[PDB]
Paper text:
In this study, we show that GAS7 plays a critical role in phagocytic cup formation in macrophages. Crystallographic, electron microscopic, biochemical and cellular localization analyses revealed that the GAS7 F-BAR domain possesses unique hydrophilic loops that contribute to two-dimensional sheet formation of GAS7 on flat membranes of phagocytotic cup, indicating that the sheet-like assembly of GAS7 is essential for phagocytosis. In addition to the F-BAR domain, GAS7b possess a WW domain, and GAS7cb and GAS7c possesses a WW and an SH3 domain, while GAS7d contains only the F-BAR domain. The structures of the F-BAR domains in both crystals were almost identical, with a root mean square deviation of 1.2 Å.
To understand the functions of GAS7, we determined the crystal structure of the GAS7 F-BAR domain, using the crystals of an F-BAR fragment and GAS7cb. In the GAS7cb crystals, the periodicity observed on the monolayered membrane appeared to be absent. The monolayers showed the striations formed by the GAS7 F-BAR domain, GAS7b and GAS7cb, all of which indicated the sheet-like GAS7 assemblies with striations similar to each other on the membrane. The zymosan phagocytosis was rescued by the endogenous-level forced expression of GAS7b and GAS7cb in the knockout cells, but not by the GAS7b ΔFFL2 mutant or the F-BAR domain fragments.
Residue numbers in the entry:
A (entry chain B): 173 to 475
B (entry chain A): 172 to 474
The structure:
């Protein structure tokens, strides 16, 4: 059995299968254990720190997306401001008659249009922009605490590692104290030396009692970092899936708003179309000749 | 017996028989404009046709103004499309990888597609609605002011025949005074000179009558040419106007049509986005990332 950076994997020999925790589905709690070194020589970080960077970049994407929608909204606003300003414009005003009414309704239909696109800007803000920004508001914080809570367990792993090395030398280097009492008692021997085989053999029996406790507490405070590793990577995986589905959801609402917006726009012409059917040249000629006529009597001769 | 205003003779405002309307019901230009009209004040008191021209003119004016309105719309559209295009190239949330990444990418593109649609529309507007409003009877300002002097000239040529009659009706009566006042001077001290003078200033009272004859006959003629020409070249105006109306109608109808199909093609630019959002699978992405960034594969043991 091997040991790299204070965590003991079994040795790369006759490896008993190793059943994956969560099969098929590429679990965060399965494919991240042993650490990884930065391609250079330094920056050799934890088999988890990447999960944080993924999480943080995630909440990051999220924000950039929202910023994008803001830009779209600003665009929209302006488009509406302009259609509005044009809709108030004084052009071709004095056109009288059914045709006049018709033009007028065109000039108005630009205002309707303006509204539609504006309302759309607002629903963008409401249903797409905000819920992206304000989704898990402080999250880089919850993540950076969820970080060093692991880091701390890895430190409490490394101290038990040092604790076993400076209590493994205690055994092996004081086993010279069992060997130097059968090899170096072979000179004097049999005297009041009730200490060479009795006492100094204990530094090879008290030091077994050292490595026992230190490897017990290493192995304990490892499979305590291990289990809180499993569960708080699963918590990440879950939170991630959740993020994806949230973004997907709100993007679907972006398309949805788009869709229904365009639909309400292509409808602001129906009043115009409606008035344009009622446009009758001859009726207008009436409503005008009535109002401006001069005499209906046709001249004769003399005297 | 029969009146005469501004050199044109209508029958007296008594019980004048019916007056068959030229073109009945339909308020024909050649029916309700004969007698002139005064500016509501006292001056200026203008011709009973000038208004028909002024209307034609206001017409081609309206026409222009309308084109200018559409222009503005087009400017607006051009801009909106430009901005949507700039945003479509925008780099936000780029590093989102995975099926969600592709989906987001397609959102950013749909803005370009959209932009395109709105531009294609600004164009269809310029071609099919703006231009045809400006360039409808391009020289109309020419043909109207020729059509003016054709009536106007016949009206001067009338007022002149009228003056010719009046100052030759004065001729008559003043050579009838020189008759009663020369027959009255016969009945006083009767001689030769004041007899031959009665023969003479009495033939001079028939030449003034055979003169008044022609002057009135020619008045009547050069009236019933202004009459005829009035009728038919008013009808020409009525026609032109109507033609205008339905031209404008038609092109507005097309404004709405373009509006319409524009919004329809816009509401289609989301189908790549919707289609891609359904292909969003968190677990698939977790696979494509855990594959490329995995480290540990093997899970720790004891000692």
């Amino acid at each position: 059995t091997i040991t790299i950076n204070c965590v003991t994997f079994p040795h790369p020999d006759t490896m008993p299968e190793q059943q994956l925790l969560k099969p098929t589905e590429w679990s965060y709690c399965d494919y991240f254990w042993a650490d990884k070194k930065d391609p250079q020589g330094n920056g050799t970080v934890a088999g988890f720190e990447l999960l944080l960077q993924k999480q943080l970049k995630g909440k990051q994407m999220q924000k950039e997306m929202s910023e994008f929608i803001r830009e779209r909204i600003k665009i929209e606003e302006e488009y509406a401001k302009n259609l509005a300003k044009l809709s108030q414009n004084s052009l071709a005003a004095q056109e009288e008659g059914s045709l006049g009414e018709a033009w007028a309704q065109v000039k108005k239909s630009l205002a309707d249009e303006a509204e539609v696109h504006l309302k759309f800007s607002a629903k963008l803000h409401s249903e797409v922009e905000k819920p992206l920004m304000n989704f898990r508001e402080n999250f880089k914080k919850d993540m950076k605490k969820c970080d060093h809570h692991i880091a701390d367990l890895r430190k409490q792993l490394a101290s038990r590692y040092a604790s076993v090395e400076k209590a493994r030398k205690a055994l092996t280097e004081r086993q010279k104290d069992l060997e130097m009492k059968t090899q170096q008692l072979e000179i004097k021997l049999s005297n009041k030396t009730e200490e060479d085989i009795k006492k100094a053999r204990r530094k090879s029996t008290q030091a077994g009692d050292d490595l026992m406790r230190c490897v017990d507490l290493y192995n304990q405070a490892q499979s305590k970092w291990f289990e809180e590793m499993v569960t708080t990577t699963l918590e990440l995986e879950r939170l991630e899936v959740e993020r994806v589905e949230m973004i997907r959801q709100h993007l679907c609402q972006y398309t949805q708003l788009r869709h229904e917006t365009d639909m309400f726009n292509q409808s602001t012409v129906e009043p115009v179309d409606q008035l344009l059917r009622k446009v009758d040249p001859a009726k207008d000629r009436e409503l005008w000749v009535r109002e401006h006529k001069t005499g209906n009597i046709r001249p004769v001769d003399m005297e």
